[PDB]
């Protein structure tokens, strides 16, 4: 935890400006660290497609955690509201290839190891909050780097 | 646990001949089930596309375990090999795109609960056999479903 603790810090102060403006939230959770992304500005709506101004910051995410052990999770997020795709099966779909999409980002910098990974899709399963407004839907649209001990 | 040891022997039954054909493989792993489902006849070779004679066996299992409490974890895995379609971006999206396959098959089992699903994509984190032969390779593609009380 200590080593873990520690990390958080540096995440922590390293994204303090996108903690600022609510692009990123981090939490610890038990023995593990939740980096929360926001889906406005990362991914279009209803889209999996990682955007370019925010492929740095998922690198820099992965430059920050290269070197502790741990498994990192990515899980992808939606809200309850039917799909309506031409691109996408489902929620699950979608929400699997934003995961996908942020996995393959992170594994692009070099000493970050590929076997630490794994990717979610967690469709509607968990709301961060009930899915009343449409301000709590967007937020249970987010994206999730869970750092593992 | 009581509800967990039914559950297994009555999948066993279910699904005897699969087993004895070798294409599931069913056991206990802990305080879970895991029912792992070989490549071969379930999905055609480097596509996610759910092959329609495994369609029912799916929904089998699904209706075996649609009245059991717990999260229904479903995994895929690839081998080792890079792979190279324009369809998939990487293995974490053929593993995870045929996790999603697996799961929407699933919720089409009336009382089967969308909310227990899980969905992982493994990419060839975690073998169970050495990537050291084709034979070996082919029986690390296949897709998980655990039980998890």
Known sequence: SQEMETLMES???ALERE???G???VENLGQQIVIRMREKGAFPEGSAFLQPKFRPL???????????PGIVRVSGHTDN????????RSNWDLSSQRAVSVAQEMEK??????????VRGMADTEPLLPNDSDDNRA?????????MQ
Chains 1, 2 share one sequence.
């Open 23 to 25: 692009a990123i939230e």
């Open 139 to 147: 937020l249970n649209r987010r994206v999730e780097i869970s750092i």
């Open 109 to 118: 910098v070099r000493g970050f190891s590929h076997q630490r990974l794994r």
């Open 11 to 13: 995440i922590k102060k």
């Open 81 to 88: 509201r039917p799909l309506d795709s031409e691109l996408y």
């Open 58 to 68: 998922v690198r820099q995410i992965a430059e920050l955690v290269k070197d502790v």
């Open 19 to 21: 903690i600022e403006q």
